[PDB]
């Protein structure tokens, strides 16, 4: 990023970014080693949660945030819409593509959960909703490659209704069912993709008309997730949980995009907290979370999963935490929706709307 920030130079930079990203892959082994230790992977993909939202709600000190072993502080969601965010996470094992290329085929080895299934992990798909709104489940299947049947939702308590009137299931009940389904799946190892949207602004209680209280809803969700973590620790089960918000809820707006709007994938909307917690270790992590400050995105999640595949971390007495958390792949914070791109160039944000000229994102 030495050339002057003209439209031609920024377009050239972005196209070079795509070309460099296309050469990046998170490489999985052909088989697990003979002494591999089984564990469960659970990826919790959450709608409408960014660092900016947590600060706006006054919840930066909720115990959940210190209940991780690794925390990414500059993770970029690369989009501000749910469907694209889920596709990008499901395609975590290859470098970042343009928005248009999310809807074109990718190499089979780009699909994180297929890479895990090929190594003997049972794949599970679980949702706190039915995925009909916005064609979300359809995109997860067609572009995210996720063909697993939806985990049974029958008899789960319903906390709210979504904007379209369909159920929003209670996260505590969903997660407790996950414990049971994984116990009963005949496999010692599994990988689950869980998408949940309790903070979505259109969720409501039928007949009430009260405006949603984001802080109260976020407090309840964080309380439920933290309680699930505490119970999972006491269970002795070997689990890797990755908490990955899709994108922010846009609680705080700015000069160019007012609060609530997500058409432009602004830095505050795409800068999301990503946390990893390990359960059932012989030597559980003791301090505050290890912080990864470098610019990161989904490729770093895939590479961390590769590093843990053999399960040795769960039986090691002296874990080299630095080895585990160092040298992960870095990714520039480029974000796209269908007709908007945001980049950082010479430490300043720029935006391109409708394929026109680049303009500074006003600050
Ligand atoms: Mg099992
Ligand atoms: Zn979403």
Swiss-Prot record:
Primary residence: membrane
Compartments, record wording: Cell inner membrane
Keyword Manganese belongs to the record: no
Effect of a null allele: When the bcsEFG operon is disrupted in a cellulose-synthesizing strain (a strain K12 / W3110 derivative called AR3110 with a restored, functional bcsQ gene), cellulose is no longer made.
Example GO biological process: cellulose biosynthetic process
Comment field (misc): Cellulose production is abolished in E.coli K12 / MG1655 and W3110 due to a premature stop codon in bcsQ.
Protein name: Cellulose biosynthesis protein BcsG
Biological source species: Escherichia coli (strain K12)
Residues of the full protein shown: 197 to 559 of 559
């Amino acid at each position: 990023q030495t050339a002057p920030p003209t439209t031609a130079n920024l377009n050239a930079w972005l196209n070079n970014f795509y070309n460099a990203e296309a050469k990046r892959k998170s490489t999985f082994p052909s088989s697990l080693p003979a002494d591999a230790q089984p564990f469960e992977l659970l990826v919790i993909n959450i709608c409408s949660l960014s660092w900016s939202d947590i600060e706006a709600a006054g919840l930066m000190s909720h115990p959940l945030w210190s209940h991780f072993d690794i925390e990414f502080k500059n993770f970029n969601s690369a989009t501000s819409y749910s469907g694209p965010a889920a596709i990008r996470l499901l395609r975590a094992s290859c470098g970042q593509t343009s928005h248009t290329n999310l809807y074109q085929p990718a190499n089979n080895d780009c699909y994180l959960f297929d890479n895990l299934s090929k190594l003997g992990f049972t794949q599970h798909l679980m949702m706190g909703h039915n995925g009909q709104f916005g064609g979300f489940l359809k995109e997860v299947r067609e572009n995210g490659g996720m063909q697993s049947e939806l985990m049974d939702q029958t008899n789960l308590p319903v906390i709210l209704l979504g904007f379209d009137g369909s159920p929003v299931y209670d996260d505590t009940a969903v997660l407790n069912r996950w414990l049971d389904v994984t116990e009963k799946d005949k496999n010692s190892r599994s990988a689950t993709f869980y998408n949940t949207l309790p903070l979505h602004d259109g969720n409501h209680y039928p007949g009430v008309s009260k405006t949603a209280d984001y802080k109260a809803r976020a407090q309840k969700f964080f309380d439920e997730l933290d309680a699930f973590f505490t119970e999972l620790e006491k269970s002795g089960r070997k689990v890797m949980v990755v908490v990955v918000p899709e994108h922010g809820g846009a609680l705080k707006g700015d000069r160019m995009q007012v609060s609530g709007l997500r058409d432009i994938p602004s830095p505050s909307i795409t800068d999301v907290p990503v946390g990893v917690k390990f359960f059932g270790m012989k030597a559980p992590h003791q301090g505050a979370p290890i912080v990864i400050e470098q610019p990161s995105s989904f490729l770093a999640i895939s590479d961390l999963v590769v590093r843990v595949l053999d399960g040795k971390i769960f039986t090691e007495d002296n874990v080299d935490w630095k080895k585990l958390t160092s040298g992960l792949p870095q990714t520039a914070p480029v974000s796209e929706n269908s007709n908007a791109v945001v980049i950082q160039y010479q430490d300043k944000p720029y935006v391109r709307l409708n394929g026109g000229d680049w303009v500074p994102y006003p600050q």
